[PDB]
Write the structure tokens for this entry.
Amino acid sequence: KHKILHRLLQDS
Amino acid sequence: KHKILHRLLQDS
Amino acid sequence: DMPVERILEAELAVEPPNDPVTNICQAADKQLFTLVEWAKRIPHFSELPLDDQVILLRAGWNELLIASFSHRSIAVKDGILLATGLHVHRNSAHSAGVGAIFDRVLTELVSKMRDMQMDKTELGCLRAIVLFNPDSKGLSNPAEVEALREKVYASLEAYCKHKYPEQPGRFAKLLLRLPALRSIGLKCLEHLFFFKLIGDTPIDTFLMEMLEA
Amino acid sequence: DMPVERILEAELAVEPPNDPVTNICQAADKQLFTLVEWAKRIPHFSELPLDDQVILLRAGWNELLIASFSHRSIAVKDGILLATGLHVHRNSAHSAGVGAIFDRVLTELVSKMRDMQMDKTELGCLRAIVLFNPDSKGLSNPAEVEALREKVYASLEAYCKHKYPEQPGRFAKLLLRLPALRSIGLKCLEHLFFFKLIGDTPIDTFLMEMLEA
Ligand SMILES: O=C(O)/C=C/c1ccc(O)c(-c2cccc(Cc3ccccc3)c2)c1
Ligand SMILES: O=C(O)/C=C/c1ccc(O)c(-c2cccc(Cc3ccccc3)c2)c1
């Protein structure tokens, strides 16, 4: 949800 | 039909 | 020993209304007969037990034919040349309901073959690797088939290094098209069952035998 | 440059009721989070555009996870070790309705990995090759992804020749497991949709996101 893949790749 | 593959491999 | 000269000879030895679906089924059946003559010319294949030859051809005929018409279409401009002589272009393929799989074939196989200038020796070796599939179920001796495959890509690597010494990754690049051929073959087989199941498209004897257990 | 040392570090960095179906879905979702941490550790992946990273992970996550649990199960006796810690053996898998795909995984992947003693460096390089899939649709620059793949199997071949100098065909043998991984991944994905479609098996967020467009 909410582009969990996108947000996991962004966060360091 | 009649194992056309079999018969094609047998015949030379 | 697995000489590339004989594998090329095998490829060279099998070299010869406008509805794409009907032509696809006609071409597949037509080339199944040619596929048997090709396999017999691959070194050591005819030496395998007869039941294993059947297993290998029943397991790889689809990919083997797909590799053939893909390489055959490298000269066609955004199109596929079927064994019946019909050139199917993007507009015709899309209008026949097979636009998606058509696009995959061109982008993942035909164009890739053309860009790297895959020659008939490399094509024959790839098809021989597919033919000698040790994963085929029922093989009386899968290790024997694996040994033949190993000899094939051993001779292929030597060929690439001698013919293309400045392309160190060419051998791996050739092998890395087999995954695409595998998934494309599975999707093509689905369409063949679409054509058969609907009963609207004629299915000839040899192709009918391959599509049935 | 693509050092195998970092790829191994990536593999090492992501190293940690009894119903097989529910565990499969739980394991897949659990390892999707770990897969992101793994990909970030593969050299140059994070340098790709964010949208391309998504494309590559959405296109290869299934095969990437399958390769992982297959290699993880080389020590298991005729069984698969899922990320949830559950060991699924042949009897349990067959009784869960997934006997066929279970058999393929063991014969075409696990057993093959064990017989050749595929190490974690070779596994990480194969998964990196899968990750850098130039056939993925939508890539803003497929050539760039292809260059990274080429660097991966360039470093892998050098590793195999240094580590296993007497196994000349080892490099090709590794690549020739990717076709099986491709077809196995497609069948596994079908079962995941069987589980989801029936609505009987719980599907968590991350896995749910991957299974939807
Ligand atoms: O010509 C030959 O020698 C052999 C041909 C052949 C063999 C096997 C096949 O599965 C198929 C096959 C089936 C389904 C879909 C496709 C794609 C397509 C091809 C052409 C136009 C549009 C789409 C190919 C074709
Ligand atoms: O454990 C992990 O880390 C990941 C696991 C995982 C990931 C993706 C998958 O598609 C699947 C997946 C699905 C359908 C069928 C199978 C075969 C099977 C596996 C076990 C027992 C019986 C059959 C695997 C599993």
